[PDB]
Amino acid sequence: GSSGSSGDYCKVIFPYEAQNDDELTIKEGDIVTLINKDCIDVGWWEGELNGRRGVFPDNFVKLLSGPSSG
Fold it and tell me: Which subcellular locations apply to this protein?
């Protein structure tokens, strides 16, 4: 089956508005590929969306365990 996971997919449920370039703009109903994790401190994370690279509030998003149906 599966050997290992390359990245981490996260489903966006809460709409956010990036204030600065650093911050990424995400809407409700979109998945963002987690690029790099945040420091021991939770609440921040970096992902790629629409060919962009910026930070975002983890709380706003969530970690997907795995696709069951489709």
Answer: Cytoplasm; Cytoplasm, Cytoskeleton; Cytoplasmic vesicle membrane; Synapse, Synaptosome
Q: What are phi and psi of 59, to 5 degrees?
A: -45, -45
12 CB-near residues (< 8 Å, 6+ apart): 26, 27, 28, 29, 30, 31, 32, 60, 61
Cα separation of 44 and 10, whole Å? Answer: 13
E strands in the chain: 8-12, 30-36, 44-48, 53-57, 61-63
**Nearest-angstrom CA–CA distance, 54 and 46:** 6
Residues recorded for the chain: 70
Closest by CA position to 26, among listed 15, 38, 35:
15
Looking at the domain 1-70, which fold is it? SH3 type barrels. (2.30.30)
